[PDB]
mmCIF file of C-alpha atoms in Angstrom:
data_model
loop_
_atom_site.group_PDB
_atom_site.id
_atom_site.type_symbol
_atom_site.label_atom_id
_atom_site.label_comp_id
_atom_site.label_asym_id
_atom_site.label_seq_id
_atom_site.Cartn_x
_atom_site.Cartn_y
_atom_site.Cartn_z
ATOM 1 C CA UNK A 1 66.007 83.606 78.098
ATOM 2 C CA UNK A 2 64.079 83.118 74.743
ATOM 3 C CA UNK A 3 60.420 84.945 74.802
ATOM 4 C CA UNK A 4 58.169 84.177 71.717
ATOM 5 C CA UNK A 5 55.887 87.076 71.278
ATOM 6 C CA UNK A 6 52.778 85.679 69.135
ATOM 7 C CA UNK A 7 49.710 88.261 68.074
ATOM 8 C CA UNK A 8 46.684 85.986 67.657
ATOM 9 C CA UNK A 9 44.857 89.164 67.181
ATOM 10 C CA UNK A 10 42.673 89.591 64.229
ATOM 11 C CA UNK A 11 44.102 93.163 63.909
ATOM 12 C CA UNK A 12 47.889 93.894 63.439
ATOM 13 C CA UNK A 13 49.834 95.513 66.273
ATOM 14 C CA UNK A 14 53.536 96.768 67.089
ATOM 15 C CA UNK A 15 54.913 94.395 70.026
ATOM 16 C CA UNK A 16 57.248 96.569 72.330
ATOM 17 C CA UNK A 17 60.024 95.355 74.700
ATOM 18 C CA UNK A 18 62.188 97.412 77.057
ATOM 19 C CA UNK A 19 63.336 97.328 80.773
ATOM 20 C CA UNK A 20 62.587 101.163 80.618
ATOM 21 C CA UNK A 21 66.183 102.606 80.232
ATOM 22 C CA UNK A 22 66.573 100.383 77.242
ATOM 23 C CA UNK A 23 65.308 97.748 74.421
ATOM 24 C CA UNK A 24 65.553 94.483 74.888
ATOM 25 C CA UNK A 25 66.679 92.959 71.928
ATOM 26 C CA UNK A 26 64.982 95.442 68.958
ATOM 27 C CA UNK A 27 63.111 96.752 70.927
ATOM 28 C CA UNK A 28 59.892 96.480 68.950
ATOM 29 C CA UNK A 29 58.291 95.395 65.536
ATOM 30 C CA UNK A 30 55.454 95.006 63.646
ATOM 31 C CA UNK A 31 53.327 91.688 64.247
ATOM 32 C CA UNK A 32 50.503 91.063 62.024
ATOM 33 C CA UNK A 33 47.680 88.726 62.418
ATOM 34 C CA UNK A 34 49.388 85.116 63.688
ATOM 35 C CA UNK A 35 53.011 86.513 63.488
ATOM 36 C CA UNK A 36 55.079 85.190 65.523
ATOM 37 C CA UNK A 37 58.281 87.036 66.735
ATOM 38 C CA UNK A 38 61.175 85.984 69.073
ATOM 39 C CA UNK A 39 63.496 87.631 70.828
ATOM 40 C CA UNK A 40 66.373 86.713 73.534
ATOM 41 C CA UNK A 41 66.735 88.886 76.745
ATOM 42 C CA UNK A 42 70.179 88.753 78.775
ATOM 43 C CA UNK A 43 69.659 86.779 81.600
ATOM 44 C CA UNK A 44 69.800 88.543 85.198
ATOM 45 C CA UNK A 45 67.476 91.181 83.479
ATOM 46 C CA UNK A 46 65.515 92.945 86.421
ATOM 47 C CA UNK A 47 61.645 95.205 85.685
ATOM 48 C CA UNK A 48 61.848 94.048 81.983
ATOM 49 C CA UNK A 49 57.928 94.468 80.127
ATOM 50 C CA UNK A 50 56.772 93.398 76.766
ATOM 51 C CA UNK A 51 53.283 94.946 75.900
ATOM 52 C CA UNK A 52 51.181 95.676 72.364
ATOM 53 C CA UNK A 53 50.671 98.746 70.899
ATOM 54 C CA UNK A 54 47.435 99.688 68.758
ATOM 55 C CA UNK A 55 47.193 101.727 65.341
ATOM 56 C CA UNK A 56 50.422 103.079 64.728
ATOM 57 C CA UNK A 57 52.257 104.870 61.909
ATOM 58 C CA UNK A 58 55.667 104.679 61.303
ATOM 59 C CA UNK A 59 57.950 106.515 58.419
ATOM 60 C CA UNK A 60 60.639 104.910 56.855
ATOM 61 C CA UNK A 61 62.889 105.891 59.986
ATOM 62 C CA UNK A 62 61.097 103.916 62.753
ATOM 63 C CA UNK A 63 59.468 107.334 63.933
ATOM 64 C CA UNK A 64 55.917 107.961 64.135
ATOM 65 C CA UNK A 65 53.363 107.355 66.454
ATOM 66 C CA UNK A 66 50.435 104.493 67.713
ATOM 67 C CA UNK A 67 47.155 104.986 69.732
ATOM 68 C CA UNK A 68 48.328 102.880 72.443
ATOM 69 C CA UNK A 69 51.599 102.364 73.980
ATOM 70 C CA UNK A 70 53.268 104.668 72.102
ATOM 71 C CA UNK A 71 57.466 104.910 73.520
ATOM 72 C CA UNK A 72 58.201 108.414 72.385
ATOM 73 C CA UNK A 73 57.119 108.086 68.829
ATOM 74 C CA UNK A 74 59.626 104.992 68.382
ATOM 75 C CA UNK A 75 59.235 102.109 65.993
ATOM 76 C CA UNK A 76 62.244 100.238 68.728
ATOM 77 C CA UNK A 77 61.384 100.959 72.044
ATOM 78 C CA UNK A 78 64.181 102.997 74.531
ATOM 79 C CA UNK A 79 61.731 103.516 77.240
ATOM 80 C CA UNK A 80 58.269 102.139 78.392
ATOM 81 C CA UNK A 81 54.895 103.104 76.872
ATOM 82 C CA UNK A 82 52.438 105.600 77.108
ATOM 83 C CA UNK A 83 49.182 104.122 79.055
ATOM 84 C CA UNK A 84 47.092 102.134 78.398
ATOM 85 C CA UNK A 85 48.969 98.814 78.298
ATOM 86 C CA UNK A 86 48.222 96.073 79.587
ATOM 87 C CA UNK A 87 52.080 94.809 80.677
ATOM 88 C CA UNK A 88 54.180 91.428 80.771
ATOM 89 C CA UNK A 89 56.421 92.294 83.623
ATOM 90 C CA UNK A 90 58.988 89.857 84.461
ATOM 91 C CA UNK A 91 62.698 89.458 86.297
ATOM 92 C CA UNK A 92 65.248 87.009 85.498
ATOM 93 C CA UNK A 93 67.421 85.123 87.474
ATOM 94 C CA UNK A 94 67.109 86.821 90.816
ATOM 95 C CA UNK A 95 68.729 84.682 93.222
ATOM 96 C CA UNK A 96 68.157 81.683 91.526
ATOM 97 C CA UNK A 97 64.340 82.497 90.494
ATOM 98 C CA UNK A 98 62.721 84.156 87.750
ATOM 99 C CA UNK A 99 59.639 85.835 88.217
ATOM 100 C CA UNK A 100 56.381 86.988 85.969
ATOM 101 C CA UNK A 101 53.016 88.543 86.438
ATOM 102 C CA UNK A 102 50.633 90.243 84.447
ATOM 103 C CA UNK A 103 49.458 94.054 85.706
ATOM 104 C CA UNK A 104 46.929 96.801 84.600
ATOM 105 C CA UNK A 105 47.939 98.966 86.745
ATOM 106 C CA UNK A 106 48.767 101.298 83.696
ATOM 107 C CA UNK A 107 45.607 100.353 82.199
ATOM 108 C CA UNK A 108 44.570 97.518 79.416
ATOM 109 C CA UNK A 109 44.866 97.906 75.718
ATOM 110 C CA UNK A 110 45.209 94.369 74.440
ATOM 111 C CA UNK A 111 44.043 90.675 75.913
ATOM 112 C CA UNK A 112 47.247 88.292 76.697
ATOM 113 C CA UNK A 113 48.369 85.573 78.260
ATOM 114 C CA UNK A 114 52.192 85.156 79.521
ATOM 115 C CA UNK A 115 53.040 81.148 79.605
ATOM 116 C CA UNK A 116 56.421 79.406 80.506
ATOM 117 C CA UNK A 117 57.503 77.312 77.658
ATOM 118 C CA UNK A 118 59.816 75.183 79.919
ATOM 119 C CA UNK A 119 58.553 73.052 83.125
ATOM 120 C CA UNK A 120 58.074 74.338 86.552
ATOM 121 C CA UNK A 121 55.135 77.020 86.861
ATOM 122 C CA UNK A 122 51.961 77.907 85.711
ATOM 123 C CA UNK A 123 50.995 81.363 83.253
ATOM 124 C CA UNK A 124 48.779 83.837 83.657
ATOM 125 C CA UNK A 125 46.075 85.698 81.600
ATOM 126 C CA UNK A 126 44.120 87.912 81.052
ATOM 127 C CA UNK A 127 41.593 88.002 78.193
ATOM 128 C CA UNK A 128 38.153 89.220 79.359
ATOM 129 C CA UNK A 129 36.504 92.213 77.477
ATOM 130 C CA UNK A 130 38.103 94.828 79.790
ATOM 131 C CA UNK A 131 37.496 97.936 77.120
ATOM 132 C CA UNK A 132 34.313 97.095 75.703
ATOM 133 C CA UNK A 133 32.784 97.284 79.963
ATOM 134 C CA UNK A 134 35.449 99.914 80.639
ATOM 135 C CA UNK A 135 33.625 102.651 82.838
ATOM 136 C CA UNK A 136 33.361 105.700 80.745
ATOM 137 C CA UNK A 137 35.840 107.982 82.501
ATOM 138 C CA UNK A 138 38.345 105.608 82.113
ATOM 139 C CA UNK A 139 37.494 105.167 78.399
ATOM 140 C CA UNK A 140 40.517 106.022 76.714
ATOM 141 C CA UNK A 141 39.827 107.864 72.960
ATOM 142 C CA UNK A 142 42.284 106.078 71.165
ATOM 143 C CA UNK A 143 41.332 102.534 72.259
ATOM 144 C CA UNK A 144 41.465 101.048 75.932
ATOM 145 C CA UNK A 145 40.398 101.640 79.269
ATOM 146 C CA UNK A 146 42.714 103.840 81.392
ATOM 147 C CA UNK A 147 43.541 102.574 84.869
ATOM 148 C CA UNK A 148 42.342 105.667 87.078
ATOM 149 C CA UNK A 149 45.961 106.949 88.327
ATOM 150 C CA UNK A 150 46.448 107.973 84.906
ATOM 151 C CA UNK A 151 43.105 109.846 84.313
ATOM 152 C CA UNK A 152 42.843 111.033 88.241
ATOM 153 C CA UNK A 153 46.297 111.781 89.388
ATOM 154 C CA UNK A 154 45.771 111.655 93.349
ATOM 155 C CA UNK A 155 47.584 109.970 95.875
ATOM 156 C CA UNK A 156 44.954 107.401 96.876
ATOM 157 C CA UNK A 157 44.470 106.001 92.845
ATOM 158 C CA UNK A 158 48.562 106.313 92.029
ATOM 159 C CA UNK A 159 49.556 105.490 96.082
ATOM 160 C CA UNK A 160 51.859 107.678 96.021
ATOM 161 C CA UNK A 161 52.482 108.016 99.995
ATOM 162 C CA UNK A 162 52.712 103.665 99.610
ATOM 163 C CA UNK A 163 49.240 103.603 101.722
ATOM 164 C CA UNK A 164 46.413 103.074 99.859
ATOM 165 C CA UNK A 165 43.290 100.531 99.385
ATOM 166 C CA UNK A 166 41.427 99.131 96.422
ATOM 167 C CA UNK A 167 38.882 101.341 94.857
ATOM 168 C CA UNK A 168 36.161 101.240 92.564
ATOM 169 C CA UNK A 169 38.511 101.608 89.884
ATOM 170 C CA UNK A 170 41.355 98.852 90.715
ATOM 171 C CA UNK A 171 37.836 96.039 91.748
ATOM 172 C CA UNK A 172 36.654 96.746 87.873
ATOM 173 C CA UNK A 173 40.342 95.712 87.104
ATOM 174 C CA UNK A 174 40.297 93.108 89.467
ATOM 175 C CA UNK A 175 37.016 91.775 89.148
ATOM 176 C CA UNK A 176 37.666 90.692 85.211
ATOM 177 C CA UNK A 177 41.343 89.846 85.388
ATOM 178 C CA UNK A 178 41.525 88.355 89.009
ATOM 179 C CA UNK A 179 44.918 87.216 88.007
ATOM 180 C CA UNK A 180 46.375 90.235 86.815
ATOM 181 C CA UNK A 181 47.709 93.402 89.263
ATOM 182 C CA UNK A 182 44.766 95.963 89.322
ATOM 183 C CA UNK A 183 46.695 98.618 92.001
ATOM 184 C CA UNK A 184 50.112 99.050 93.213
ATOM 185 C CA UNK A 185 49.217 97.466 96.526
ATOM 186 C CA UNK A 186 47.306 94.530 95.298
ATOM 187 C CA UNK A 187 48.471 91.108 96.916
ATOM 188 C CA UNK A 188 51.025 90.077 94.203
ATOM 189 C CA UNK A 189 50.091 87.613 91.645
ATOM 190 C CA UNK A 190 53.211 87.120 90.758
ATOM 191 C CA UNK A 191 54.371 83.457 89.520
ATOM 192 C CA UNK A 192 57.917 82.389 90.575
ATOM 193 C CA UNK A 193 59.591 80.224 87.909
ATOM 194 C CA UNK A 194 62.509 78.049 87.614
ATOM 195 C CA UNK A 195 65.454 80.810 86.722
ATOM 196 C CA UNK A 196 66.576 80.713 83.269
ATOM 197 C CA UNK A 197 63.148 79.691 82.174
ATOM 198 C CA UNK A 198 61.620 80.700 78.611
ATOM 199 C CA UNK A 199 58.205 81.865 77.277
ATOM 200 C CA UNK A 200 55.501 83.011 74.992
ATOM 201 C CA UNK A 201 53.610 86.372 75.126
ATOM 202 C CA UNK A 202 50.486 85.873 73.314
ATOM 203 C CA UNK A 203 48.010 88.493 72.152
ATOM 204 C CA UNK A 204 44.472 88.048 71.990
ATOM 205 C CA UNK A 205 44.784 84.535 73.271
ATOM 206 C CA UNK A 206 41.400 83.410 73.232
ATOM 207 C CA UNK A 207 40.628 84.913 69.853
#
């Protein structure tokens, strides 16, 4: 499958892909202000993510470190990144389907909206202002709004015992990006797509 990763972000950022034990395709790169970068992912690939990261540094080696999203100080990204990201998540070709969502349940860092560039389903978004009304113990210091299993560490926010509700924390979530995952138990918003369907990732989309 072909994704095209766009930033239409005023500020530059460092797009990361990996289905967490390893890159897909380079694993990551730096996107500036309407770069456009695309990338093919082996079909059949299952809990794959693309997400942004903010204010990085790298050295000549691809090692450093960014504000958001960081994947163990990586320019190409092994493993998935430190929160707060707001994720692409997306399977391929599982029984004959491919399927996408948006989630923040590790948090929001960057607006985006995840389209199908072929026929057969419908995208999803989410570009409201979720760090500037971020409640301030989510605030993350280095830009973006924590999701509260990350800052809180119980059961209840990270549902750890696989019972758990909504709370305060997950409606905020919820109540700006209805379309989006806000808590591990949320009632999916997953889109099914034709398999061996292709899209565009697109940062800041309303910018």
């Amino acid at each position: 499958a072909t994704f095209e990763i766009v930033n239409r972000c005023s500020y530059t950022v460092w797009a990361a892909a990996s289905k967490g034990d390893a890159a897909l395709d380079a694993g990551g790169r730096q996107l500036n202000s309407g770069e456009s970068w695309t990338i093919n992912v082996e079909p059949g690939t299952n809990g794959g993510k693309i997400w942004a990261r903010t204010d990085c540094y790298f050295d000549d080696s691809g090692s450093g470190i960014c504000k958001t999203g960081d994947c163990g100080g990586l320019l190409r990204c092994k493993r998935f990144g430190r929160p707060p990201t707001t994720l692409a998540e997306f399977s391929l070709n599982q029984y004959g389907k491919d399927y996408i969502d948006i989630s923040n349940i590790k948090g929001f860092n960057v607006p985006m909206n995840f389209s199908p560039t072929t026929r057969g389903c419908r995208g999803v978004r989410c570009a409201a202002d979720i760090v500037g009304q971020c409640p301030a113990k989510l605030k993350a210091p280095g830009g973006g709004c924590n999701d509260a299993c990350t800052v809180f560490q119980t059961s209840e926010y990270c549902c750890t015992t696989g019972k758990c509700g909504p709370t305060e924390y997950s409606r905020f979530f919820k109540r700006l990006c209805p379309d989006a995952f806000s808590y591990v138990l949320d009632k999916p918003t997953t889109v099914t797509c034709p398999g061996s369907s292709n899209y565009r990732v697109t940062f800041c989309p309303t910018a």
